[PDB]
Amino acid sequence: RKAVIKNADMSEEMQQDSVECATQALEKYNIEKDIAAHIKKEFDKKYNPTWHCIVGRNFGSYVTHETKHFIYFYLGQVAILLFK
Amino acid sequence: KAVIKNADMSEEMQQDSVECATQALEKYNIEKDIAAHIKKEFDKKYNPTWHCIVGRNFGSYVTHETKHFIYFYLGQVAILLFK
């Protein structure tokens, strides 16, 4: 599934890590809640917590993030907002 | 009409959210601008930093401070507040 990015505020390696983490989450789970959970858990494996992930098709958000930890992208027809 | 699915605080902030949500329903047509107003109203009254997610179809894992978490439905629109 194609990974287009709407807003990226980090490095290229971190962007690709988020892309593969969303891909494995959508392949492992079919419920949006479990997909966002799996993104945050494979981020909770190799990254310190207070990260946050949202997975869905019809959702807006208003958040304030710390520096260099904000991405919002699409993988297929599902929007993923991953901020910290 | 407010449909509380999970409310981790005391009912005063929930009542304030219901009141300003009704005011935003009268003021604005779109739940997008209502979603903007929900965060912009409660960020300054209860200090930084609040976070709000509003939509009709979304899954999310949340990290919040205690007594500062709510998830509810205004009609068919789901609204989530946390830290």
Binding site: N58, S61, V63, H65 | A36
Partner: peptide, 9 residues
């Protein structure tokens, strides 16, 4: 951040 979804995207 101002992120929102239009009707029928």
């Amino acid at each position: 951040v101002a992120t929102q979804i239009l009707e029928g995207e």
